[PDB]
């Protein structure tokens, strides 16, 4: 539980990392790799029946989904950041929402 | 079809040293008795049935060999394998295509 909480905290803190550092992908994806290691840890302990899902497995899969979405949204942010000005024209509504409001 | 696989496991029972001419075995009922069966957390018994079979070999035309074969058709409960195996694979497969963005 405590390693999962720490990994979740790092997944949160990825979004404060500046795009110019070039380190969002490494942090988020290594968090996912660590969570896979903890899945391997749990593989030897959890029950093997199929009538319901253990709550710890639910928490682990919730954490993995969170880290996956952190990777996805970091990719989206980097796509916006590294967008070529001459090839890509900013639509006006993007300006009104994300620069003014 | 694992983890959505259905099995059909039989139990052949017979008098090892006595042939049908000296000992005859007959089923008590058409089906195995599941009155005191404990519910499994990984399999569901869809069907069950016992069949009596008499076989005469060419070398032994006067000593038929009898058996009773109880078969159990079982359908796996796939929730454990869906949650623990398939969902992480789906997450990795979805993350695979994000590199092109
Ligand atoms: C899972 O796997 C098991 C095998 O391990 C299957 O069991 C077979 O089930 C079928 C029926 O579904 C059995 O066939 C039936 O055999 C009966 C007995 O025949 C034997 O005994 C006589 C007398 O000694 C011999 O002459 C004969 O050669 C055999 O040795 C028959 O009485 C049955 O006839 C009835 O059904 C048929 C078909 O509907 C009708 O036409 C007849 O009129 C009559 O109503 C029938 O033939 C078979 O023998 C079983 N095998 C074994 C080894 O047990 C399961 O069916 C299978 N489950 C699924 C869902 O796939």
Structure-solving method: cryo-EM
B11 touches B69 (CB < 8 A): yes
**Is residue B67 within a helix (H) or strand (E), and if so which, with residue range?**
strand B60-76
- Nearest CB to B91; choose among A48, A68, A75: A68
Ligand 1 residue neighbourhood (C-beta within 6 Å) = B 8, 10, 47, 51-54, 69, 71, 73
Going from the C-alpha of B65 to that of each of A8, B14, B24, the distances in angstroms are 67, 8, 9
Q: How many residues does this entry show for chain B?
A: 101
- Distance of alpha carbon B36 from alpha carbon B38, whole angstroms: 6
8 Å CB contact of B80 and A43: no
Say yes or no: A20 contacts chain B, CB-CB below 8 A: no
Q: Using an 8 Å CB-CB cutoff, list chain A residues near B41.
A: 47-51
- Distance of alpha carbon A28 from alpha carbon A7, whole angstroms: 9
8 Å CB contact of B79 and A71: no
CA-nearest residue for atom 35, ligand 1, is B51
Radius of gyration of chain A from its Cα atoms, rounded to whole angstroms: 18
The closest of B96, B12, B84, B14 to B42, measured between CA atoms, is: B84
Classify the phi-psi angles of A22: left when phi > 0, otherwise alpha if psi is within -120 to 50, otherwise beta. Answer: left
């Amino acid at each position: 539980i405590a390693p999962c909480i720490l990994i979740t905290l790092l997944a949160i803190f990825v979004f404060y990392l500046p795009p110019d550092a070039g380190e969002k992908m490494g942090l988020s994806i290594f968090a996912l790799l660590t969570l896979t290691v903890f899945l391997l840890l749990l593989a030897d302990k959890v029950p093997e029946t199929s009538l319901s899902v253990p709550i710890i497995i639910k928490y682990l899969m919730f954490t993995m989904v969170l880290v996956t979405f952190s990777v996805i949204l970091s990719v989206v942010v980097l796509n916006l950041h590294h967008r070529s000005p001459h090839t890509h024209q900013m639509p006006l509504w993007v300006r009104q929402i994300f620069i003014h409001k | 079809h694992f983890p959505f696989d259905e099995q059909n496991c039989s139990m052949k029972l017979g008098t090892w040293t006595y042939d049908g001419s000296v000992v005859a075995i007959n089923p008590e009922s058409d089906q195995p008795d599941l009155s005191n069966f404990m519910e499994s957390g990984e399999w569901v018994i869809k069907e069950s049935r016992g069949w009596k079979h008499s076989v005469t070999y060419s070398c032994c035309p006067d000593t038929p060999y009898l058996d009773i074969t109880y078969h159990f058709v079982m359908q796996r409960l796939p929730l454990y394998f869906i949650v623990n195996v398939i969902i992480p694979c789906l997450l990795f497969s979805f993350l695979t295509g994000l590199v092109f963005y």
